[PDB]
Amino acid sequence: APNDPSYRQQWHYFGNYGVKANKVWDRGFTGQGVVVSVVDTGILDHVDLNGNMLPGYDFISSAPNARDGDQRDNNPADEGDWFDNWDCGGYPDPRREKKFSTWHGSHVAGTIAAVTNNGVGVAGVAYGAKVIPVRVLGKCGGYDSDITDGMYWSAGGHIDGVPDNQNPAQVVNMSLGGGGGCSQNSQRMIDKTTNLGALIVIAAGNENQDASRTWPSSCNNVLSVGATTPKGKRAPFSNYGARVHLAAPGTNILSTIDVGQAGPVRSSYGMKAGTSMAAPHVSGVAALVISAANSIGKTLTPSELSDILVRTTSRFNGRLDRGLGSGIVDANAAVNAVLG
Ligand SMILES: [Ca+2]
Ligand SMILES: [Ca+2]
Ligand SMILES: [Ca+2]
Numbered sequence: 001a002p003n004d005p006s007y008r009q010q011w012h013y014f015g016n017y018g019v020k021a022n023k024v025w026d027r028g029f030t031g032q033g034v035v036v037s038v039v040d041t042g043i044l045d046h047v048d049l050n051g052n053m054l055p056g057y058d059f060i061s062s063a064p065n066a067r068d069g070d071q072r073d074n075n076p077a078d079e080g081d082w083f084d085n086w087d088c089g090g091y092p093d094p095r096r097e098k099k100f101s102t103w104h105g106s107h108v109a110g111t112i113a114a115v116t117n118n119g120v121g122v123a124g125v126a127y128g129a130k131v132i133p134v135r136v137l138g139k140c141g142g143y144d145s146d147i148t149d150g151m152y153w154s155a156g157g158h159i160d161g162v163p164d165n166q167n168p169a170q171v172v173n174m175s176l177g178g179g180g181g182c183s184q185n186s187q188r189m190i191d192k193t194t195n196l197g198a199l200i201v202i203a204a205g206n207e208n209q210d211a212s213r214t215w216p217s218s219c220n221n222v223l224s225v226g227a228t229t230p231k232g233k234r235a236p237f238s239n240y241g242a243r244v245h246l247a248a249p250g251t252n253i254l255s256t257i258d259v260g261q262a263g264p265v266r267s268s269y270g271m272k273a274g275t276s277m278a279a280p281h282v283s284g285v286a287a288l289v290i291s292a293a294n295s296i297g298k299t300l301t302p303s304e305l306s307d308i309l310v311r312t313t314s315r316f317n318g319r320l321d322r323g324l325g326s327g328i329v330d331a332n333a334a335v336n337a338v339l340g
Helices: 021-026 104-113 144-154 184-195 275-295 302-311 331-339
Strands: 035-040 130-135 171-174 199-203 223-228 246-249 253-258 267-272
Touching (some): 021 275, 021 331, 035 104, 104 275, 144 171, 275 302
Parallel strands (some): 035 130, 035 171, 199 223
């Protein structure tokens, strides 16, 4: 086992209805040589993250919502996405009044590749891999075009006025949403990204509805991830249906955060729930599978990788109330499939 003091609490890696990532670490595969992008709120300066992060980019076009004094820039630091007094609209709906900083991108990045076996904090699923933080979400979420520009650039796509990404990602984690079906432009950007050779892994969404009514799960060429509990059942918030392909642990997920309710104050660790936490389990397992395929000189297309991940899932706890794909992502079975 890795020596990280809080790894023992990360049931979602090793325990019942977890992803069996420990079995693959034991086999010697950790995501070595794989780049995963996290298209999210940005990144924290965090002792348990830094060593595994590569240069990213900040695609937030709104200077106000980015909280860093400018528009697009080369520092994807998460300044905090808190708001208060309906600063992001919606008055007088009490549900939209206020929120504390989520540190979402860092929590997600930690699930993929927290610095592991370093005697502090937590472990990550693909702790041999590296993450590129692609900041697209600020105070009031993100603009669609900022999200898809970032996604595309993260796979090695050229964006005008942005230096070319020197660390193209083979797995693109999008733990984000947006209401409604897939726009023609979004699909175009998604297809371009996939066809570069990158697997796009997305959170199914947290509105307890059919995923076909939300972006990006309504899009083609994305791997859509639902959220399960320690009980191996659907998390009550998880979007569902035919547009969900598989599931991963999505509640009581311990990862890297900051204690700050507004701006950053001190690096810490904390549990969260969301399909946003389930997606990085899948992205992490995808990186494990690529590292294994690399070891035998096997090329995997995103379609082939996606099929392995869906094909080899472990069983749900009996029966679900709504469809959540083929099963829970299983790193051990997935790697067994590629190594033959
Ligand atoms: Ca900026
Ligand atoms: Ca910035
Ligand atoms: Ca650690």
